[PDB]
Amino acid sequence: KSMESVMVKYDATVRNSINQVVQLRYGEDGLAGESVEFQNLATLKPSN
Amino acid sequence: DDEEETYRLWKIRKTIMQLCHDRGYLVTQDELDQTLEEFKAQFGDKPSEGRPRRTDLTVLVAHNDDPTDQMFVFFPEEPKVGIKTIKVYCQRMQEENITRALIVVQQGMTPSAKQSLVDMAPKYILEQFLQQELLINITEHELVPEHVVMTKEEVTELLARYKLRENQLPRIQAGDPVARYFGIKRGQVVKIIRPSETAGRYITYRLVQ
Amino acid sequence: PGFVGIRFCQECNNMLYPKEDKENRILLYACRNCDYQQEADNSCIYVNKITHEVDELTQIIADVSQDPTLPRTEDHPCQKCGHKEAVFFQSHSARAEDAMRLYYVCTAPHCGHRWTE
Amino acid sequence: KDILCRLEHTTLRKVTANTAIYYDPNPQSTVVAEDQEWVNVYYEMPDFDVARISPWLLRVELDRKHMTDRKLTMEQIAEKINAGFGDDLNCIFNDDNAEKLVLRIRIMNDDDVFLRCIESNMLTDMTLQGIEQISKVYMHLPQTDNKKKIIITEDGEFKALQEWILETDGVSLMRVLSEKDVDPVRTTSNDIVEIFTVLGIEAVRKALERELYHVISFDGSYVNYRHLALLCDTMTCRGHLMAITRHGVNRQDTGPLMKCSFEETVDVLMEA
Amino acid sequence: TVINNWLLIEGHTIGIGDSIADSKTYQDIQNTIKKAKQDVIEVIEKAHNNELEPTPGNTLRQTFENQVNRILNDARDKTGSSAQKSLSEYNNFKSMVVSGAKGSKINISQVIAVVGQQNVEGKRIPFGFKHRTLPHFIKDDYGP
Amino acid sequence: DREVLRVIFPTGDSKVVLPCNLLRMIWNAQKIFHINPRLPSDLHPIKVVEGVKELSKKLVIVNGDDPLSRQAQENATLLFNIHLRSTLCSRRMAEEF
Amino acid sequence: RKLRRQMDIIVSEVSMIRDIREREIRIYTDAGRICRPLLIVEKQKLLLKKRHIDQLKEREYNNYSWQDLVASGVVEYIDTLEEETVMLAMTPDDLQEKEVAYCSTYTHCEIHPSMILGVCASIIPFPDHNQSPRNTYQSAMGKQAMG
Amino acid sequence: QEKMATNTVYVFAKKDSKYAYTGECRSCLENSSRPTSTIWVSMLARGGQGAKKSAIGQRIVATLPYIKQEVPIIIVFRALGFVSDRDILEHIIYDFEDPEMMEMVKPSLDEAFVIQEQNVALNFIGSRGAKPGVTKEKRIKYAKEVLQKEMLPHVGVSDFCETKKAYFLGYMVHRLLLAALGRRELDDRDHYGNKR
Ligand SMILES: [Zn+2]
Ligand SMILES: [Zn+2]
């Protein structure tokens, strides 16, 4: 009941019922939560 | 104690220098980060009725550009500040032509003086800070992301690009400790850069209300 | 030091209260219902044991040896009567029961000796 | 341990062993079998008359264990009492000659029970060490790398340094952060309102995000970051903490029908 | 569909033969229980004589309570491990646990070896009676 | 990108959620096109670099050309582009893929 | 107790509790206390002798009922207050033979441990081999079976 | 239906209220048409000062039926016809050789040394009742009625039951002192020896 109107508008932004922007892009990246997977950053944790 | 007092005064001085630099003022590089021993040599190493007393280290700084406006900082002698004490600072300011200033209170301000501070806002702006607020530069904390004050042209560009009004931006309190640190007034969009674990970087905006 | 007890009046049998003598510089117990005075015995009129180092053997009674639900031992004889059987139990009190100290009570009749191991 | 003692709220009650009040009109012939009175015997501090004229005294004996653990001395306690009571009180301590740590307190110049009243007011809130609003603090070495100091070596490889961390039972930032030898950057908190008073709203958004992820992923479950970010952003898209009740949801302009859809229905419509 | 229709040929069950270990495993379980029980008793006799020293950070009673819970948890884990080394690869409890379909290693340990310590509010069974849990036990009995 | 990641992730972990499973897609391409990776490859590394740059141009979260939208697009796909460069670099495509 | 083991004056339901640690002795005659019968252990010997069983098997002939055994001073009703001051033997075949002695100071003996269960928990075969939530759920289902 | 066992003294700890240890006795005489009337014998906690410059110790206070104010224990004992502090201490503390318990009861005894007469004690009992008194008259009788037929009906309701009621109230205060000392453990609300 606190967030039953927070949706993604057609400019890919996240606004509540009164058009106040909660997030500029959904999840701070604009990506939905279904088509994502856990991945390993190979550039991270090497020695120089 | 006397060494504790000079350490506290040096930490307040360092925090004020960092606050002025982050606010966009002329802060000398060695003054921006000086050693405690350097402060003791420059001021006297005895705050207990001695050389590094208050009102000796009233820091006067100008702006990086438009060097006219200054907020030469104030350090009252008494713990509990009052109207008859801030009127001396008002006299010193009206002696000058500069409207901004910061006072560093030791204990809490009397609420009548709190109302008095607002009672001259259009004429000349006065901000107040407690000792505990200036013993740590909160912008250095890992929980505090990068707050950057935006110019009016950038605010217009933002509102024109996103086709939204100032009423629709997520907002921030005027009494926010970070907002008080930058001394932003009402209606002044602040861009916030913070790292995100899902996109790398995220820039949000907080209009002041 | 030691504890301080409540002094009692002799006429109306109320509680006596400490007061000073402006003349002889001595403490006097004085009643408030009547007007009766007594010479003090000690300078200690108030005491407060805060670390709470109490002699638990005073709170132990001998009749607890008759409890069937207390465990007995033939490993520790009584110091006084030499009886080989004695019951052992914990402190059974608050401001306590942080250390598991055994208290022995000899179960021999008409001796009732208790001690701490 | 030194920082641990400098943070924990240490009252006089936690240090004292026992206390009592006496009536010793002649300090020269002290009734409590002490010759340390040589101080008063040769003291030029006001003898009596208007001074130690008070015959009744406060004899409080400290224990050696808590004085050793808290890293305290007799002079520090006497100085704290003098600072907190002005010149109305006189304190004579004991040197490190015996285990019996003696503080003798006299009134300097209601009648006799006032000393007992200040005895209670001295056992309660003297604040010898540490800050207020805090109970016993526990320190430990972390095991999970979230608390372990992750550094980057000169060859670029990460390393997990296992350094001592503290963990309090009360909450007071901007005062622990002011203490020396305390990292003012990574020192987080568990309460959110206290951070909102100290570190602002966006730091509260990050703190709420971390605490919410902590309470969610404690039992090994996983929840995507989109939902945590959205909840922490809706609660902080107003400037202040929007508590999820009627007290926080029904204070924002959303609509009388929307606000009456929540727990309070008639009152919202009447006000609208 | 196809795995169920192969399961018709294969067949899967569970029974009382899947809950019984060989006598050597039972001897190992009983030896471990006896050793842990004697260890708890000797810890108790250390605590009575004030020879137990308090761990820095808590009371003496909790140094005792931590020791007893640590010993009993070690006994439960060791007995569970020694029990789950004797399934012989045909035990249906292992068939369901290894596949992760239903159950865990703890269920196998409790069925075969030992149920373990029973807890109320995160600690042991409190003294509901006067300094004893049940009227069948002597007063002040901190045993397993 | 390595410096940016080490600023972003002070804790030494890289288990991060991203849309396209690039390693699996590379493996799928190997299985579809019958690589036989014992033989020398026949893809030009400059084609790899230019293709990655063009792909990073094609992945659009934020439209527009003004620098504010450019920064928004850069920040929206900062982590994914870092991962895309790391997985689809010239060295790995020439040696292990 | 000697009068309660004979029903001279005090009824069998009335309970005496001697607080030994603190010098108190309380006798409860209220209406609402909940008790249960227990055997009486004089020495490490039960008072339920073989002759009682012989007279109890031949009921409807000797008219030797449960109340006669209560009058014989063999069993008595112990309530919850009195259970705090009783040493209760679980079974006689284990807790009255000499061993490395546990207490050797038993006052009462449980008749049978299966009598701690209710009416619906008594129809469960091998209830101790189950898990307690399963026993509770069966107790819920047992009052629902058709029949 | 379960219920707390009547006519039995219990010592509980309202750790959230202003009382350290609170005693109670849901007194209900058998074969009496009137229901039970619980009397509370509480000790104000305020472990340090009593929010004053003179209130040092903890004061024991009693919540009587049909009386809305916290009546002191000594006031009730004086109202029962026991004027001497020594006699009240005899009825409360049965040993005069343990000064610690006497010292603990000392602040409560020293709260009400102003009221010394049975008449004044009963007048203070009648002050702030569920049915307030008119004057000195008809309020002495109401207080006498409350002390006769409202508190402790299980120890008797008669003219000669003054001393028996005093003995049982002294036992309640003594048990509260034991609970405050820890010499006797606190009572459990779920122990089934405490239920009917
Ligand atoms: Zn008198
Ligand atoms: Zn003996």
Cβ(H50)–Cβ(H44) below 8 Å: yes
| Collapsed DSSP state (helix, strand, coil) of residue C94 | coil
Question: DSSP letters of B49-78?
Answer: TSTT-TTS-----BBSSSTT-B---B--SS
Using the beta-carbon criterion (under 8 Å), do F11 and D225 form an inter-chain contact?
Answer: no
Please give the single-letter amino acid code of residue E104. S
**Does the beta carbon of G80 lie under 8 angstroms from any beta carbon of chain H?**
yes
Token pair recorded at residue D18: 């026992």
Beta strands B171-172 and B200-208: pairing type?
Answer: parallel
Beta strands A7-8 and A14-15: pairing type?
Answer: antiparallel
Chains that touch A (3 or more CB pairs under 8 A): B, D, F
Contacts of H47 in chain D (CB under 8 A): 124
Backbone phi and psi for residue G62, each to the nearest 5 degrees, phi listed first: -85, -10
How far does the centroid of ligand 2 lie from the alpha carbon of residue G105, in Å?
A: 20
Using the beta-carbon criterion (under 8 Å), do F18 and A39 form an inter-chain contact?
Answer: yes
Where does residue F34 fall: left (phi above 0), alpha (psi -120 to 50 degrees), or beta otherwise?
left
Alpha-carbon gap, residue D196 to H84, rounded angstroms = 60
Token pair recorded at residue D127: 């604040």
Cβ(G77)–Cβ(G12) below 8 Å: yes
How far does the centroid of ligand 1 lie from the alpha carbon of residue C37, in Å?
A: 9
Q: C touches H (3+ CB pairs < 8 Å)?
A: yes
In 3D, which of A25, A31, F78 has the Cα closest to residue B162?
Answer: A25
Using the beta-carbon criterion (under 8 Å), do A22 and B170 form an inter-chain contact?
Answer: yes
Q: Cβ neighbours of residue B117 under 8 Å, at least 6 residues apart?
A: B86, B109, B126, B128
In 3D, which of D140, C96, D13 has the Cα closest to residue E56?
Answer: D140
CATH number at D97 reads 3.30.1360.140
What DSSP character marks residue E138?
P
Question: DSSP letters of C6-27?
Answer: PPB-SSS--B-EEEE-TTT--E
Alpha-carbon gap, residue D170 to D191, rounded angstroms = 10
Residue of F69, F71, F75 lying closest to B199 (CB–CB): F75
Mutate to test the interface with G, among E136, E137, E139 (most CBs of G within 10 A): E136
**Does the beta carbon of B173 lie under 8 angstroms from any beta carbon of chain A?**
no
> How far away is chain B from the Cα of A22, in angstroms, using its nearest Cα?
7
Neighbours of H31 (CB within 10 A): 4
Token pair recorded at residue H72: 């002191």
In 3D, which of D248, D247, D245 has the Cα closest to residue D237?
Answer: D248
| Collapsed DSSP state (helix, strand, coil) of residue B194 | strand
Where does residue C84 fall: left (phi above 0), alpha (psi -120 to 50 degrees), or beta otherwise?
alpha
Count CA atoms closer than 13 A to B95's CA, side-chain side.
Answer: 7
- List chain H domain ranges: 8-196
Residues in chain E: 144
In 3D, which of D255, F55, H88, F2 has the Cα closest to residue A43?
Answer: F2
Using the beta-carbon criterion (under 8 Å), do B162 and A13 form an inter-chain contact?
Answer: yes
Using the beta-carbon criterion (under 8 Å), do B200 and F79 form an inter-chain contact?
Answer: yes
Using alpha carbons only, give the angle D32, D37, D40 rounded to the nearest 5 degrees: 130
Alpha-carbon gap, residue A37 to F15, rounded angstroms = 10
**Domain of D15, in residue numbers:** 2-129
Alpha-carbon gap, residue B156 to D147, rounded angstroms = 43
CA distance to B21, D188, F6, H16, per residue, from B194 (Å) = 20, 17, 14, 43
Residue of C64, C71, C72 lying closest to G21 (CB–CB): C64
Ligand nearest to the CA of C35: 1
Beta strands D56-62 and C114-116: pairing type?
Answer: unpaired
Cβ(C57)–Cβ(C66) below 8 Å: no
Chains that touch E (3 or more CB pairs under 8 A): C, G
Using the beta-carbon criterion (under 8 Å), do C15 and H85 form an inter-chain contact?
Answer: yes
Residues in chain C: 117
Cβ(H176)–Cβ(H21) below 8 Å: yes
Contacts of H102 in chain C (CB under 8 A): 5-6
Cβ(D258)–Cβ(A18) below 8 Å: no
Resolution in A: 4.0
What DSSP character marks residue H108?
H
**C40-46 long-range contacts, Cβ below 8 Å, gap at least 24?**
C40/D23, C42/C4, C43/D22, C43/D23, C43/D24, C43/D31, C43/D32, C44/C1, C44/C2, C44/C4, C44/D20, C44/D21, C44/D22, C45/C4, C45/C18, C45/D21, C45/D22, C45/D23, C46/C4, C46/D20, C46/D21, C46/D116
Count CA atoms closer than 13 A to H181's CA, side-chain side.
Answer: 21
Alpha-carbon gap, residue D142 to B191, rounded angstroms = 36
Alpha-carbon gap, residue B76 to H58, rounded angstroms = 45
Neighbours of C89 (CB within 10 A): 20
In 3D, which of H194, E137, E138 has the Cα closest to residue G79?
Answer: H194
Alpha-carbon gap, residue B169 to E101, rounded angstroms = 50
CATH number of C49-117: 2.20.25.10
The burial of F66, by beta-carbon neighbours within 10 Å (0-12 exposed, 13-18 middle, 19 or more buried), is given as: exposed
Contacts of E139 in chain C (CB under 8 A): 67, 69-71, 89
Q: Cβ neighbours of residue H148 under 8 Å, at least 6 residues apart?
A: H157, H159, H161
Neighbours of H145 (CB within 10 A): 14
What DSSP character marks residue B25?
B
Question: DSSP letters of G13-66?
Answer: T-EEEEETTTTEEEEE--SS--EEEEEEEETTEES--HHHHHHHHSTTTS---H
User: Which residue of chain A has the CA closest to F9?
Assistant: A44
Alpha-carbon gap, residue G82 to G26, rounded angstroms = 10
User: Which residue of chain D has the CA closest to F3?
Assistant: D156
The burial of E143, by beta-carbon neighbours within 10 Å (0-12 exposed, 13-18 middle, 19 or more buried), is given as: exposed
Cβ(G122)–Cβ(G114) below 8 Å: yes
Count CA atoms closer than 13 A to D260's CA, side-chain side.
Answer: 11
Ligand nearest to the CA of C30: 1
CB interface of F with B, residues 48-87, below 8 Å: 64, 66, 68-69, 71-72, 74-80, 82
| Collapsed DSSP state (helix, strand, coil) of residue D234 | helix
Neighbours of D154 (CB within 10 A): 6
Neighbours of D133 (CB within 10 A): 11
CA distance to B15, B32, D98, per residue, from B18 (Å) = 5, 6, 52
Question: DSSP letters of D62-95?
Answer: E-HHHHHHTT--HHHHHHHHHHHHTTSEEEE---
| Collapsed DSSP state (helix, strand, coil) of residue H115 | coil
Token pair recorded at residue B84: 């008859």
**D75-78 long-range contacts, Cβ below 8 Å, gap at least 24?**
D76/D128, D77/D12, D77/D15, D77/D103, D77/D128, D78/D103
Residue C106 annotated as binding site: yes
Q: Going from the N-terminus, what domains does chain B have, and what CATH number goes with each?
A: 1-136 (3.40.1340.10), 137-209 (3.90.940.20)
Separate counts of helices (H) and strands (E) for chain F: 6, 1
Using the beta-carbon criterion (under 8 Å), do H185 and C3 form an inter-chain contact?
Answer: no
Using the beta-carbon criterion (under 8 Å), do H84 and C4 form an inter-chain contact?
Answer: no
Radius of gyration of chain A (CA): 16
Cβ(D175)–Cβ(D198) below 8 Å: no
Using the beta-carbon criterion (under 8 Å), do D146 and F6 form an inter-chain contact?
Answer: no
Alpha-carbon gap, residue F31 to H7, rounded angstroms = 86
What DSSP character marks residue H4?
B
Using the beta-carbon criterion (under 8 Å), do D230 and A22 form an inter-chain contact?
Answer: yes
Which residues in F have their CB inside 8 Å of a CB on A?
Answer: 1-2, 5-6, 9, 12, 14-19, 21-23, 61-62, 72, 76-77, 79-80, 82-83, 85-87
Please give the single-letter amino acid code of residue C26. I
Which residues in D have their CB inside 8 Å of a CB on F?
Answer: 145-146, 150, 152, 158, 160, 224-225
Using the beta-carbon criterion (under 8 Å), do B176 and D201 form an inter-chain contact?
Answer: yes
Cβ(H37)–Cβ(H153) below 8 Å: yes
> How far away is chain G from the Cα of H50, in angstroms, using its nearest Cα?
32
Sign of CA dihedral H130, H131, H136, H137: negative
Token pair recorded at residue H171: 């036992």
Please check whether the domain covering H8-196 is classified as CATH 3.90.1110.10: yes
Using alpha carbons only, give the angle E100, E101, E106 rounded to the nearest 5 degrees: 55
What DSSP character marks residue A37?
E
Residue C44 annotated as binding site: no
DSSP H or E segment with residue C38 = strand C37-39
| Collapsed DSSP state (helix, strand, coil) of residue H168 | helix
**Does the beta carbon of B158 lie under 8 angstroms from any beta carbon of chain F?**
yes
Cβ(B179)–Cβ(B172) below 8 Å: yes
Ligand nearest to the CA of C14: 1
Q: Cβ neighbours of residue B5 under 8 Å, at least 6 residues apart?
A: B47, B48
Beta strands B200-208 and B190-196: pairing type?
Answer: antiparallel
CB interface of D with B, residues 152-211, below 8 Å: 174-175, 177-178, 180, 184-188, 195, 197-203, 206-207
Contacts of D207 in chain B (CB under 8 A): 143
In 3D, which of D233, D242, D208, B178 has the Cα closest to residue A24?
Answer: D233
How far does the centroid of ligand 2 lie from the alpha carbon of residue B194, in Å?
A: 78
Cβ(D167)–Cβ(D140) below 8 Å: yes
Alpha-carbon gap, residue H128 to H135, rounded angstroms = 12
Locate CATH 2.20.25.10 in chain C: 49-117
Calculate the CA B38 to chain-centre distance: 23
Backbone phi and psi for residue D82, each to the nearest 5 degrees, phi listed first: -65, -40
User: Which residue of chain C has the CA closest to G21?
Assistant: C64
Alpha-carbon gap, residue G100 to G94, rounded angstroms = 12
In 3D, which of E7, E22, E21 has the Cα closest to residue E101?
Answer: E7
Contacts of A23 in chain B (CB under 8 A): 204
In 3D, which of B179, B194, B117, B114 has the Cα closest to residue B149?
Answer: B179
Residue C78 annotated as binding site: yes
**Does the beta carbon of B196 lie under 8 angstroms from any beta carbon of chain A?**
yes
Using alpha carbons only, give the angle E125, E130, E133 rounded to the nearest 5 degrees: 25
DSSP H or E segment with residue G142 = helix G132-142
Mutate to test the interface with C, among E52, E62, E138, E141 (most CBs of C within 10 A): E138
**Does the beta carbon of A48 lie under 8 angstroms from any beta carbon of chain D?**
yes
Using alpha carbons only, give the angle G4, G9, G14 rounded to the nearest 5 degrees: 50
Using the beta-carbon criterion (under 8 Å), do E135 and G102 form an inter-chain contact?
Answer: no
Residue of A12, A31, A41 lying closest to F86 (CB–CB): A41
Q: Give per-residue burial for B51-64: e unless 16+ CB within 10 Å, then b.
A: ebbeeebbbebbbe
In 3D, which of H165, H189, H158 has the Cα closest to residue H64?
Answer: H165
Q: Give per-residue burial for H80-102: e unless 16+ CB within 10 Å, then b.
A: bebbbbbebbebbbeeeebbebb
Q: Cβ neighbours of residue D269 under 8 Å, at least 6 residues apart?
A: D256, D260
Alpha-carbon gap, residue G96 to G104, rounded angstroms = 7
Contacts of C48 in chain D (CB under 8 A): 18-20, 119
Question: DSSP letters of H30-90?
Answer: TT-SS--EEEEEEEE--SS--SSSS--S--EEEE-TTB-S-EEHHHHHHHTT---HHHHHH
Please give the single-letter amino acid code of residue E3. I
**Does the beta carbon of A45 lie under 8 angstroms from any beta carbon of chain F?**
yes
Question: DSSP letters of B103-162?
Answer: EE-SSPPPHHHHHHHHTTTTT--EEEE-TGGGSS-GGGSTTS-EEEEPPHHHHHHHHHHH
Residue C9 annotated as binding site: yes
Q: How far apart are the first and last CA of chain H?
A: 8
How far does the centroid of ligand 1 lie from the alpha carbon of residue C11, in Å?
A: 6
In 3D, which of G16, G33, G15 has the Cα closest to residue G25?
Answer: G16
Residues in chain D: 272
Cβ(D52)–Cβ(C73) below 8 Å: no
Q: At what angle do helices F78-87 and F22-33 cross, to 10 degrees?
A: 40
User: Which residue of chain B has the CA closest to A16?
Assistant: B168
